[PDB]
């Protein structure tokens, strides 16, 4: 017509009828994902070993180099390099740069900025459809995890070394090396996540049971339950009241939603603001405000000191604190 | 029924019993309610006033300085190990007093808590027959019996103690939880790999689900306040499973279309977790536990080159192992020089 | 390598892949 | 009757919850103030966990034998 | 008055309030 | 159209293909132990019992040929310290190929009550279709499981007629398979004491016969009818189900 | 009737000593790993007890279904005939 | 329409021949309960014993007790 | 006897273990071939020490 | 050996889902 | 002899061959790290 | 009914928050104290 | 033993085994 070339590009990505919407948020979001997939698998399968502690010991991450799924592994960035942007170019030769660290500090860059914008599309389309705009909050209690234990936990720490690998093993020692530095056990964020996930399954065990426990008759015995339910059809599907009536008799009757709109919000404000706190958690923890610490405080008369669980945790992070790192450590506290 | 049948002093029971109220008593009332009532009065009464200085040596309780998250009902010690510690049997004998001293308030708790579980369950199901609907609350509140008969009973029934039981308290199950780490690598069974991903996943689809159907919601009130329009007997559906259908089809690439398989698979998600982190603890009972991986242990002897974040970890349980099992477990009288145990530098 | 290694899992691959597929087919020709 | 309001209102509910409860709280003071809790349960005051026979932390290693060994721990 | 929702509240509130004497004694016991 | 795990609720209906099916997988079970066996025989390292033992070699389902009575090969071998004079037909081949045939009899079986599903044993009189009298059936199953019961202590262990178990020192260091003699006191609930296991044989035994001919005899009530459901055919199985576990239990522990 | 004194030979059975007695094997018949493993009586109970752990899933499933039977399918239209 | 008849069938076609028939009221309801809360009695006898929780005098519960 | 010597071994204790780790026994640390008898540990002064 | 195993079962896991994408069945309304 | 009239049809739609295949081939992933060892 | 419910909550809920006060109050000092 | 013996048998085996199931189950539902 008498449009444009760019009016002809914009009623393309905002073109709701495409079968993976881009958005303008896609347009950014889909090539740093790609990037960031398609080094993640190559430097998960061919890496050479990485420095990761500067003490030129480089550890193995690759399936190539003698490792199974679990302890396969993206190797952190070096210590020597820190919080320096290292990218590809500033490395002399490419060998120069995977041994330092290289893939880890590409990958977590690409990443992070890709799973802010995919918060971003994801408000994007609710405004496409119609729909209120709040799946994009919901998708932030993540974002916030996961941009606290690549990006703000190693400013904190001022190295990249500290953050957490791209490995299933290497999840693991980074949780055990935290607990040993700074007590996440013993915080009281991690204790809210901790019941942000607890509480965040039974209220998804109990609400899926009670809908299934309330199917109405709609099919034989031969045939399957789900074949009662037909695709955006109008009435309900299930008796509400009877859910209601049944969980009110179980523990008393103030003790239950009769309003499923009050329902549904209770089902997505409880893990998300549980996982809120988990998130700031180790971002408080990533500016050394530890946790409780509650060692020799048990004394009686006579200047004697009695042992509590809370001195049994102790010698479990004496034990890891003398053992991570186990060639770094020229001096006798662990400032780094 | 249909044929005059007599009444008899059972049949004039069960309508006192399945009578209307404001808490339900029914049949299983009499197996919950003596057994759920002491199960948790038994814990506040051990974390207040009793210690464990004679069991493990350590200070439990309100009145001796411990707060909240310090408080525990300890396990009985390592010389019993499989008693059930009555309070008029051999290791008590009557005495009461005597009888908290040496742990056996612990097993009073985990005892009155197992009938508590079973009683509860059958709560679910009377109540609803009596409303006529499916079971299938009761069916996943088998789960939360399957992880508390496997760790709390199983394990130390399979262990050499119930001093290797978890404790009724906070920081003591922190312990317990320090306890698998580096004595079993409970963190490399698949098994508990599968539980994260059943708690984690079903932490998903609480949040997914409650805030698709709050964002597709139908204009149905014209105060903004949108909890205020839900007459609960209307017959039409309060969200769009169109609109939502159509939302993660084009974010996510594949959505639900289906509300009744919707809700079920929020129900098999945690069920399965937790049932298939049950039978991890199986193994871990006779310490039949996923160690080692036999083929970098040994690239590992012969090369100091070579390491991994496996062999990383390997050093970490060391750690754990060879510090706290002094204090840990007092029975076995051991004393370590500064010497064996291992360490970095500085 | 463990020698029934591979072949435990080759097994436990396409055994139950070729179960499903069976049920499927016989499903989508009606 | 009583449907949860018109307890929490009526001035017949705290002429009776004014005078129980304090009387239940007093005698919960009583119960440890007096030292009478260290004895009815066992726990050691804070001048009683070591006594001059032992000078580190119990232990009992004989399983039919506890009754009479920890009366020795105790001290008594 | 003897009701099954009495007791229920009544089995929970007065051990309570005794043990709630309690701890608050227990922060007055010096060293 | 069925889900794919209702699939096999195609043979709660009618009584016929109920034991074509039970068949089937008593064909399979007993088959699978004839394979295990001379699968194992033909891995097993009879040279050295004092110190690469029957236990060490990592061995399964040998012990339990071993424990009712069966020390003898076709090989010539035993455990114990000698060869054999003669094997005789129960040997641990011949064992092994005991269950096979059984296999192979009852895979026919199966294939016989698959076909003539449809006989007038099960269609009851006075409806004319499919039942089943559930509790008289039970009667006849837990009359004979007793006799089984009764004839294995009073034979099988006590050596009247058959060899024994396998009885040991405390420490190992010796013991084979003799006859032993029912203990009636409180030591025949030591666990240890294998006089417990000939005398529960023989007293568990007569118990289910008189409950055997209890539960022929005796119509079960209308009130307990309706409370346990009597009439389906799955109430037996959530209880049956119910029972093994509780015997998986004792087993393992 | 043996002696040694040597620094090498000594913590070579030392650390054996630990194991309970010390013994002669032969790690080339069976290509041994040096690793222990399990005795059957350890593989009977691991087995006889996540099947029995099992099975107590299953007692509840069809002891739910027989009770529950008639509203297998689905519960009916009305059942609106408790609210209080 | 007729099953099928053999000449095992009906042989055994009076045992499988009375389904439905019970005993009006209670029967030996309360008879089944005596036995039934001596078995759990029963089992608490070797429990107790096999937890050593209850000591007799002619038991001791180890391995020297199976050697005679 | 050498049969009383090997049943008080370590490596015969079932709790001693591993889930992935198939097969026999024999398989873990090889045939047992013969007892290579009792360590008795010395002090320099003679005086007997306990593992 | 396991190098190339590990390899096809994690491309396998992303064929099945580029598979569960495109190829979906198509849900029809009403 | 007569024709059974309990026979029954089974079905396994496409949603339901993925969630089947998605199933063994990720804890295929899992335990073959494990059967190696 | 008599009394008004909302000056009920508020000296239940001051009664509440001064007894929880207490509780921190005690953890500084006496037992536990860490001194 | 050829430790690819028993797996390009096991596989010749299953896969056109599991070929012709198919086309006749399918079949056999008409
Ligand atoms: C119904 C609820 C219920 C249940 C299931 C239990 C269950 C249990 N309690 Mg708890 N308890 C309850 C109510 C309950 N209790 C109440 C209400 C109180 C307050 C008084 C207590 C107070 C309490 C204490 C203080 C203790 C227990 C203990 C126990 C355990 C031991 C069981 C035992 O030895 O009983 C054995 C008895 C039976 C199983 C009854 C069987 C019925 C018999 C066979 C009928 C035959 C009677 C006949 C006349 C006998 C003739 C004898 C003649 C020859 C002389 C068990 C877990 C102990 C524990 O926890 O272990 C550490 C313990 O120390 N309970
Ligand atoms: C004595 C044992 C027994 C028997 C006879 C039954 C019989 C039945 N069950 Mg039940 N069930 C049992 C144990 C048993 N169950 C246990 C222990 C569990 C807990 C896991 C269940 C859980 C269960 C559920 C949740 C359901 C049934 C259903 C059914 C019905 C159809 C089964 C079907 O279509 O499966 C079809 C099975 C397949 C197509 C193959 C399954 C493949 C399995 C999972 C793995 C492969 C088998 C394995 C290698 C064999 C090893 C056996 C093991 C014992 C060693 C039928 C009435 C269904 C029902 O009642 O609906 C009407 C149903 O929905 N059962
Ligand atoms: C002359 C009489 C006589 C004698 C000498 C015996 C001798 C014996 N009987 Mg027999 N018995 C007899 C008559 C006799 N019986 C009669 C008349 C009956 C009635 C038919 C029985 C019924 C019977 C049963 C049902 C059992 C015995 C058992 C035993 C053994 C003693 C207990 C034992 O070994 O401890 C070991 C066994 C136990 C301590 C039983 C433990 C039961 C626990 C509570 C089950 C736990 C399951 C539960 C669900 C918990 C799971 C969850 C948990 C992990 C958290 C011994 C061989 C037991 C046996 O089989 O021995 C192995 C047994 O279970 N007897
Ligand atoms: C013809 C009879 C016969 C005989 C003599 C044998 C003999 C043998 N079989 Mg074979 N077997 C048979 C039939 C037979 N089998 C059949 C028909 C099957 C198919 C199901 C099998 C399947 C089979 C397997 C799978 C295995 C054997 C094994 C064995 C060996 C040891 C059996 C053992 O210790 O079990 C001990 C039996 C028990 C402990 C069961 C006790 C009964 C329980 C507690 C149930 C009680 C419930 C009941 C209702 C009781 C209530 C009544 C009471 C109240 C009165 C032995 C060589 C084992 C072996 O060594 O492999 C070769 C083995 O693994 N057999
Ligand atoms: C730590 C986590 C956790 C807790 C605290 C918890 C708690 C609860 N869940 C319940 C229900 C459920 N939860 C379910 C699934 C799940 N539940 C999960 C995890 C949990 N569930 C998970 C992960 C799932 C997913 C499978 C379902 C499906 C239900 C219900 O339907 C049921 C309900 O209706 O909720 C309202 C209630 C049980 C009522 C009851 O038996 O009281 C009676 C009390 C008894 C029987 C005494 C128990 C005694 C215990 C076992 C031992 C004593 C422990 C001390 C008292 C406390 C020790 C505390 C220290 C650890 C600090 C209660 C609110
Ligand atoms: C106790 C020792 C063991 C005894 C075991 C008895 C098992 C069978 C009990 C009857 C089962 C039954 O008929 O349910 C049948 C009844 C149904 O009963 C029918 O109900 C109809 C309803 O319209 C009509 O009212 C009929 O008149 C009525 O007969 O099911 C129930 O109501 C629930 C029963 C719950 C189980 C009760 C078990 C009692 C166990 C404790 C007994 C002792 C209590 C003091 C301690
Ligand atoms: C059925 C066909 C479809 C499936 C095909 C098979 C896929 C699964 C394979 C089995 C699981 C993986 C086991 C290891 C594979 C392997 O390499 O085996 C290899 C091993 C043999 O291992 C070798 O053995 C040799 C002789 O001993 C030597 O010792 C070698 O050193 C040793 O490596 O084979 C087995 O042991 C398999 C036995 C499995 C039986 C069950 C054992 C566990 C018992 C408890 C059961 C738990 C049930 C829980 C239920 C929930
Ligand atoms: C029905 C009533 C059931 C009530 C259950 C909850 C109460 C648990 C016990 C609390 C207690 O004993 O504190 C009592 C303790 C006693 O306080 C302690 O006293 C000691 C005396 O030697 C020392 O002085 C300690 O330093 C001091 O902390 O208070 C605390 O430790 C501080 C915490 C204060 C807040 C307590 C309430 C916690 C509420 C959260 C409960 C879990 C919620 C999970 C879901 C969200
Ligand atoms: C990154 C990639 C890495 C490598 C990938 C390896 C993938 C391996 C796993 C493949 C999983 C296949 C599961 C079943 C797929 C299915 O059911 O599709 C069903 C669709 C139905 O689509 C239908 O098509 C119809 C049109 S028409 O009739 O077909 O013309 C239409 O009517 C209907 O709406 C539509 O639904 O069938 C097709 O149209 C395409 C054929 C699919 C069958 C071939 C798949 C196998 C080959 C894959 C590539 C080689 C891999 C080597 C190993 C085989
Ligand atoms: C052992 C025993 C027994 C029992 C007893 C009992 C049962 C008791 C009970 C008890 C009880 C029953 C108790 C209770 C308690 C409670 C408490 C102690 C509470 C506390 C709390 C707190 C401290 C807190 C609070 C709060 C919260 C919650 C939060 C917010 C704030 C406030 C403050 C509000 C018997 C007899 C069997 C036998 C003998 C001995
Ligand atoms: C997966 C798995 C499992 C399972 C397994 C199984 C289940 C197995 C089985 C196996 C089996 C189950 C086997 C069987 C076999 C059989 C056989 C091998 C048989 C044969 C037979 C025959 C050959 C016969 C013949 C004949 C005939 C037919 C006619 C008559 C005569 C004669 C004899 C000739 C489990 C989980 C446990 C674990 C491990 C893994
Ligand atoms: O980097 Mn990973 O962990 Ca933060 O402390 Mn120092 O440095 Mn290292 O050690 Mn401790
Ligand atoms: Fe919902």
Redesign the interface.
């Known amino acids: 017509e008498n449009s444009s070339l760019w009016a002809r590009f914009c009623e393309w990505i905002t073109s709701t009828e495409n079968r993976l919407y881009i958005g303008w948020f896609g347009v950014i979001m889909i090539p740093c994902l790609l990037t960031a997939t398609s080094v993640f698998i190559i430097a998960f399968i061919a890496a050479p070993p990485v420095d990761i502690d500067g003490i030129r010991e480089p550890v193995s991450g690759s399936l190539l180099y003698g490792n199974n799924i679990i302890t396969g592994a993206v190797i952190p960035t070096s210590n020597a390099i820190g919080l320096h942007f290292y990218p590809i170019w500033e490395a002399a030769s490419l060998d120069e740069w995977l041994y330092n660290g290289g893939p880890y500090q590409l990958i977590v860059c690409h990443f992070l900025l890709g799973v802010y914008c995919y918060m971003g599309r994801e408000w994007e389309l609710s405004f496409r459809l119609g729909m209120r705009p709040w799946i994009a909050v919901a998708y932030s209690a993540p974002v916030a995890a996961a941009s606290a234990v690549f990006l703000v936990y190693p400013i904190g720490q001022g190295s990249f070394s500290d953050g957490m690998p791209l490995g299933i093993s290497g999840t693991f020692n980074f949780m055990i090396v935290f607990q040993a530095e700074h007590n996440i056990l013993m915080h009281p964020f991690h204790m809210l996540g901790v019941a942000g996930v607890f509480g965040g399954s039974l209220f998804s065990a109990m609400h899926g049971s009670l809908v299934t426990s309330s199917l109405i008759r709609e099919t034989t015995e031969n045939e399957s339950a789900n074949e009662g339910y037909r695709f955006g059809q109008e009435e309900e599907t299930y008796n509400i009241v009877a859910a209601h009536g049944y969980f009110g008799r179980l523990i008393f009757q103030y003790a239950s939603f009769n309003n499923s709109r009050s329902l549904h919000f209770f089902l997505a404000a409880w893990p998300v603001i549980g996982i809120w706190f988990t998130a700031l958690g180790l971002s408080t923890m990533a500016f050394n405000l530890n946790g409780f610490n509650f060692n020799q405080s048990v004394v009686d008369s006579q200047g004697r000191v009695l042992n509590t669980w809370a001195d049994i945790i102790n010698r479990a992070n004496l034990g890891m604190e003398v053992m991570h790192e186990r060639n770094a450590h020229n001096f006798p506290l662990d400032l780094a | 029924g249909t044929y005059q049948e007599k009444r008899t002093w059972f049949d004039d029971a069960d309508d006192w019993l399945r009578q209307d109220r404001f808490v339900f008593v029914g049949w299983s009332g009499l197996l919950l309610f003596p057994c759920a009532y002491f199960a948790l009065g038994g814990w506040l009464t051990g974390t207040t006033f009793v210690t464990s200085w004679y069991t493990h040596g350590l200070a439990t309780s309100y009145l001796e300085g411990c707060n909240f998250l310090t408080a525990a009902v300890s396990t009985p010690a390592n010389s019993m190990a499989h008693s059930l510690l009555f309070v008029w049997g051999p290791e008590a004998q009557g005495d009461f007093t005597r009888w908290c001293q040496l742990g056996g308030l612990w097993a009073f708790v985990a005892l009155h808590g197992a009938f508590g579980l079973i009683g509860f369950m059958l709560r679910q199901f009377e109540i609803a027959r009596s409303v006529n609907l499916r079971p299938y609350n009761a069916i996943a509140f088998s789960a939360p019996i399957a992880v508390f008969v496997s760790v709390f009973l199983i394990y130390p029934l399979g262990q050499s103690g119930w001093f290797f039981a978890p404790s009724f308290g906070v920081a003591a199950i922190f312990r317990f939880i320090l306890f698998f780490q580096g004595f079993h690598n409970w963190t490399l069974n698949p098994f508990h790999m599968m539980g994260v991903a059943g708690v984690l996943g079903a932490a998903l689809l609480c949040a997914i689900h409650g805030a698709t159907v709050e964002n597709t919601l139908f204009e149905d009130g014209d105060g903004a306040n949108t909890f205020r329009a839900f007459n609960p007997t209307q017959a039409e559906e309060t969200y769009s499973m169109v609109t939502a259908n159509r939302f993660w089809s084009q974010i996510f690439g594949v959505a639900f279309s289906n509300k009744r398989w919707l809700h079920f698979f929020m129900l098999l998600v945690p069920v399965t977790g937790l049932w298939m982190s049950a039978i991890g603890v199986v193994g871990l009972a006779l310490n039949l536990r996923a160690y080692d991986f036999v083929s970098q242990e040994i690239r590992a002897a012969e090369d100091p080159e070579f390491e991994t974040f496996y062999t990383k970890n390997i050093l970490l349980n060391e750690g754990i192992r060879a510090w706290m099992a002094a204090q840990d477990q007092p029975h076995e009288r051991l004393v370590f020089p500064e010497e064996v145990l291992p360490r970095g530098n500085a | 390598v463990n020698i029934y290694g591979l072949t435990a899992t080759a097994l436990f691959i396409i055994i139950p892949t070729s179960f499903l597929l069976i049920l499927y087919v016989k499903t989508a020709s009606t | 009757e009583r449907p949860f309001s018109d307890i929490l209102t009526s001035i017949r509910y705290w002429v009776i919850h004014s005078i129980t409860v304090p009387a239940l709280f007093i005698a919960g003071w009583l119960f440890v103030s007096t030292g009478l809790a260290y004895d009815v349960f066992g726990t050691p005051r804070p001048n009683e966990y070591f006594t001059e026979d032992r000078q580190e932390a119990p232990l009992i290693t004989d399983r039919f034998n506890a009754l009479e060994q920890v009366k020795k721990l105790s001290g008594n | 008055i003897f009701t099954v929702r009495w007791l229920a509240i009544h089995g929970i509130a007065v051990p309570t309030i005794f043990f709630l004497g309690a701890i608050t004694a227990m922060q007055f016991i010096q060293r | 159209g069925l889900p794919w795990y209702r699939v096999h609720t195609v043979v709660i209906n009618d009584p016929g293909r109920l034991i074509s099916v039970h068949l089937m997988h008593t064909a399979l079970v007993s088959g699978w132990a004839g394979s295990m066996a001379l699968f194992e025989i033909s891995v097993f390292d009879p040279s050295d019992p004092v110190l690469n033992p029957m236990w060490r070699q990592g061995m399964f389902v040998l012990p339990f040929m071993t424990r009712l009575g069966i020390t003898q090969s076709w090989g010539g071998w035993t455990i114990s310290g000698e060869t054999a004079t003669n094997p005789g037909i129960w040997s641990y081949e011949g064992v092994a190929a005991a269950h096979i045939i059984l296999s192979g009899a009852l895979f026919l079986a199966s294939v016989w009550h698959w076909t003539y599903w449809d006989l007038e044993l099960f269609r009851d009189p006075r409806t004319g279709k499919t039942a089943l009298d559930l509790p008289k059936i039970f009667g006849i199953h837990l009359f004979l499981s007793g006799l089984l019961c009764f004839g294995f202590g009073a034979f099988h262990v006590t050596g009247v007629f058959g060899p024994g178990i396998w009885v040991s020192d405390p420490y190992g260091l010796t013991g084979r398979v003799q006859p032993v003699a029912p203990s009636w006191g409180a030591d025949g609930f030591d666990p240890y004491n294998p006089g417990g296991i000939a005398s529960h044989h023989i007293a568990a035994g007569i118990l289910g016969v008189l409950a055997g001919l209890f539960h022929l005899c005796v119509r079960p009530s209308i009130r307990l009818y309706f409370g346990l459901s009597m009439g389906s055919i799955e109430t037996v199985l959530s209880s049956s189900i119910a029972a093994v576990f509780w015997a998986a239990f004792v087993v393992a522990g | 009737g043996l002696t040694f004194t040597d620094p090498a030979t000594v913590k070579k059975y030392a650390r054996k000593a630990q194991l309970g007695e010390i013994f002669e094997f032969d790690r080339s018949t069976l290509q041994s790993d040096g690793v222990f493993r399990s005795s059957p009586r350890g593989w009977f109970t691991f087995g006889h007890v996540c099947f029995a752990l099992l099975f107590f899933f299953g007692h509840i499933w069809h002891g739910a279904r027989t009770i529950f039977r008639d509203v297998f399918a689905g519960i009916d239209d009305d059942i609106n005939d408790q609210v209080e | 329409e007729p099953g099928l008849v053999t000449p095992l069938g009906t042989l055994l076609r009076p045992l499988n021949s009375e389904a439905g028939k019970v005993l009006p009221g209670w029967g030996t309801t309360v008879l089944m309960a005596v036995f039934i809360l001596l078995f759990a009695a029963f089992l608490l006898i070797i429990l107790e014993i096999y937890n050593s929780s209850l000591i007799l005098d002619d038991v001791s519960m180890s391995w020297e007790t199976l050697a005679k | 006897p050498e049969k009383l010597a090997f049943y008080d071994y370590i490596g015969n204790n079932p709790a001693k273990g591993g889930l992935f780790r198939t097969g026999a026994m024999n398989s873990g640390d090889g045939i047992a071939v013969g007892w290579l008898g009792h360590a008795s540990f010395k002090d320099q002064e003679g005086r007997e020490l306990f593992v | 050996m396991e190098a190339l195993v590990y390899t096809f079962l994690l491309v396998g896991t992303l064929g099945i889902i580029f598979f569960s994408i495109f190829f979906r069945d198509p849900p029809r309304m009403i | 002899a007569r024709p059974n009239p309990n026979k029954q049809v089974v079905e396994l739609n496409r949603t339901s061959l993925y969630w089947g295949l998605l199933l063994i081939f990720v804890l295929a992933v899992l335990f073959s790290s494990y059967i190696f060892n | 009914?008599?009394?008004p419910?909302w000056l009920?909550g508020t000296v239940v809920g001051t009664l509440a928050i001064g007894?929880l006060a207490?509780?921190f109050?005690?953890?500084y000092?006496?037992?536990?104290?860490?001194?």
Do not use: H, Q, T
């Not at chain 12, 000092?29 to 001194?35: A, D, E, I, K």
């Open positions: 009914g008599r009394i419910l009920v007894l207490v509780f109050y005690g953890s000092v006496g037992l536990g104290s860490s001194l």
